[model samples]
Target: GALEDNEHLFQFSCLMQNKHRRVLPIDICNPLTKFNFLECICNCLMTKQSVNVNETDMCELFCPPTCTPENYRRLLCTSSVFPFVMWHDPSADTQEAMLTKMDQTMSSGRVGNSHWVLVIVDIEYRCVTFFDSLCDYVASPQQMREQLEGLAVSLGAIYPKLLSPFQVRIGSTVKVQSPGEFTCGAWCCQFLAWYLENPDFDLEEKVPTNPSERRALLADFISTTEQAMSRYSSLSWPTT
Candidate 1:
């Protein structure tokens, strides 16, 4: 297939925002980030990279061109993993139950949210890449940076850059997969599975924005379950 024309690429990136639209995202909070579903998305993308080896060279396949391997590596890490486990949510292991903190200051206040998000901050890129489907809480994206900086302090780094957002990845507009209520987690999973399957980042074409799009994504979820089952059946983790 011919590569998407440059004109089309430009159009997608410059999507118009609808300031009038309301945040209809239901209270369907991300009840569980420990569910490393983000890692699952990364694994599938890697498998695809092998089959379509050429895809690895494409800048926007997983992230924009601004995100290089070196800086991308930084956001992958979190309070727990130094070398992050592939786009891992540093905010995972947060909340009262799973606090993966470096110290008391790092674990200050409510660290994670019932509404989950995937944040990738690149100082060199001068922007943040986030995947979320809820109304913005007052702290969120900043919360990600604060905790990330805290981890840096623990490592005794001198003058790590503090990050703030300039551009938003999703337009002020979205297709609202979770119907603004309770299945936001399920929708997020669907979003991840659908987006990476494509060879290019065609936000309009890839992200599920409506009931049909949501329904169309069922296949990916089904595939993930089968793959997980197969993986577990093959694992021998509890060594006797």
Candidate 2:
């Protein structure tokens, strides 16, 4: 069993180079592995210069039973410098802050701590799109909207100019090629990655559906590969 023990299968640092870089054997399993898989990939996507969108690991912020508005303001809509923030809220101040006012934002997290869901906010267009692989089983579009109402209210208070009267669009499920029971995280990850890669996604284009393949791809990205930087060369997070 020692030979089969592959706890340290993958390791790498994120944008913050935080403690949660290690991708263990458990991370690759289904029925939802953990939030780190999404976090790591998001940090990498945030590193993209040309297509920079304000992204954060809401999984961490919303971990508590209920996140306070003060906490949301302090953590999310404070000093960010991107129009397209990726979370439920936008972060910024003054003329500089006004420019930083989020035109759009994307967020993915758990609903009732059971399934994964992705929400995209477009203050510019006045639209919010909610994606759920199993909407019928998990929650309806209205239910998802109910969860994010606080986010919208807080953001509107900050940047009243672009205060969104946004309508929630129930995004069609990106059907998985295989009928895997726990591919919600995988679907959300792919959606977030693709959104960052190119915000103007073609609705006609097909989405990748193999969750196992996605996990492997994420593993390769995290590991020291020819295409990516070596984990040793990268700077450590929280320098003591």
Candidate 3:
């Protein structure tokens, strides 16, 4: 509201007079050049006899502002619907099979005492988000199992039963599911389930509310997830 309230307004009536006319190139490499060009264009574009490009007496255009935390959270939650639908298929009798597989793989990987990283990337903004959890040592298999189980629960919580199936289906379809379709389904389902169970748990709040803040968040999420993946699997992030 403050930005909108402070936006500048201009009239086109002054453009009609030849005395106020000016010309500039269409291409520019720098903001200063663009600013000067805009000044000239605005001077010429506003006049009593000026040609109207659109219906409005004044034309205004600018980059869309970054979203606030509330707005970002709403967007994340809304977008989560599609993925939830894609992953969990209610028609499948063995809906929990994927979850079982996730447990087995995570357990086996923990034999050597490892860590797993999970990353979620937002393509639109070219940003990544991650969750890092360490698997307990082989001697403490129970602890590792519990931690992994907890991750699964968190996934379930973030996405309720109704929403979990879709996310699994969609995530699988997109080839973003980890350990293939079945494993991805389980990981997403359980992770979301666990996330939901915690009263303070939130995926939306983790997203950056402003464009300026998103850069750092994205890098951190990506790096963290990369590390987790390395520990869980032999996989490493893309170096190129």
**lDDT: which candidate is best?**
2
lDDT per model, in order? 0.32, 0.35, 0.25
Q: For residues 25-119, write the lDDT of model 1, one tens digit per residue.
A: 11111122334433433342243333334334332333334335333222222111111111123454544433233123123432233343443
Candidate ordering by TM-score (highest first) = 2, 1, 3
User: Which window of 10 residues has the lowest lDDT sum in candidate 3?
Assistant: 1-10
Regions of model 1 farther than 4 Å from truth: 1-113, 121-127, 135-175, 193-200, 219-226, 233-240
Clash totals in order = 5, 3, 48
Question: Per-residue lDDT of 45-135 in model 3, one digit per residue for the tens?
Answer: 2311122222223212221133233322222232311111111112223525533433453345322211122223222222222332211
Q: Model 2: runs farther than 4 Å from truth?
A: 1-114, 121-127, 146-154, 202-204, 208-240
The root-mean-square deviation over C-alpha atoms between each candidate and the true structure, in angstroms, is 16.3, 14.7, 25.4
Give the alpha carbon lDDT tens digit for every residue of 49-90 in model 2. 112234334434432223343332332332221111121112
Better of 1 and 2 by TM-score: 2
Greater lDDT among 2 and 3 belongs to: 2
